[PDB]
């Protein structure tokens, strides 16, 4: 406890990392964090739009072997995080 607060903190942390990893070419730590989240949760964004942005600008941050269509079959990272904390 509190699981709700933990999940919220994790999502906020991911959001901040995602923003840095995409905006800055040299946000080394942020990119590492984001890549780990994405590989672990099989996602590539906080929502449908940011997922699309990431796939277009920094596709290497997405799970390996992805393309422009892949997000259609993926829950976003917020949804994946929620799942972990609502089981």
UniProtKB/Swiss-Prot annotation:
Source organism, top-level taxon: Eukaryota
Per the record, ranges on the Extracellular side are: 1-87
Intracellular or extracellular location(s): Cell membrane; Basolateral cell membrane
* Disulfide cross-links: 43-77, 44-62
Q: What happens when the gene is disrupted?
A: Knockout mice exhibit reduced female fertitily and impaired egg-sperm fusion. In response to notexin-induced acute myoinjury, mutant mice display abnormal muscle regeneration characterized by typical giant distrophic myofibres. Mutant mice show reduced allergen-induced lung inflammation, eosinophilia and mucin production. These mice spontaneously develop multinucleated giant cells (MGCs) and show enhanced osteoclastogenesis when compared to wild-type littermates. CD81 and CD9 double knockout mice develop pulmonary emphysema, reminiscent of chronic obstructive pulmonary disease in human. (Microbial infection) Mutant mice are refractory to Plasmodium yoelii sporozoite infection.
Give the induction annotation. Answer: Up-regulated in response to notexin-induced acute myoinjury.
Q: Where is this site: Important for interaction with integrin?
A: 3, 31, 35
Give expression by tissue. Answer: Expressed in oocytes (at protein level). Highly expressed in granulosa cells. Expressed in skeletal muscle mainly in endothelial cells of endomysial capillaries, in satellite cells and myoblasts (at protein level). Expressed in hepatocytes (at protein level).
What post-translational modification information does the record give?
Not glycosylated.
Q: Reproduce the free-text note on domains from the UniProt record.
A: Binds cholesterol in a cavity lined by the transmembrane spans.
Please report which protein family the annotation says this sequence is part of. Answer: Belongs to the tetraspanin (TM4SF) family.
UniProt subunit comment: Homodimer. Part of a complex composed of CD19, CR2/CD21, CD81 and IFITM1/CD225 in the membrane of mature B cells. Interacts (via the second extracellular domain) with CD19; this interaction is initiated early during biosynthesis in the ER and enables trafficking of only properly folded CD19. Part of a complex that includes MHC class II/HLA-DR molecules and IFITM1. Interacts with IFITM1. Interacts with IFITM2 and IFITM3. Part of integrin-tetraspanin complex composed of CD9, CD81, beta-1 and beta-2 integrins in the membrane of monocyte/macrophages.
Its job? Structural component of specialized membrane microdomains known as tetraspanin-enriched microdomains (TERMs), which act as platforms for receptor clustering and signaling. Essential for trafficking and compartmentalization of CD19 receptor on the cell surface of activated B cells. Upon initial encounter with a microbial pathogen, enables the assembly of CD19-CR2 and B cell receptor complexes at signaling TERMs, lowering the threshold dose of antigen required to trigger B cell clonal expansion and humoral immune response. (Microbial infection) Specifically required for Plasmodium yoelii infectivity of hepatocytes, controlling sporozoite entry in hepatocytes via the parasitophorous vacuole and subsequent parasite differentiation to exoerythrocytic forms.
This chain's protein is named CD81 antigen
| Organism listed in the record | Mus musculus (Mouse)
Q: Which residues of the full protein are shown?
A: 114 to 200 of 236
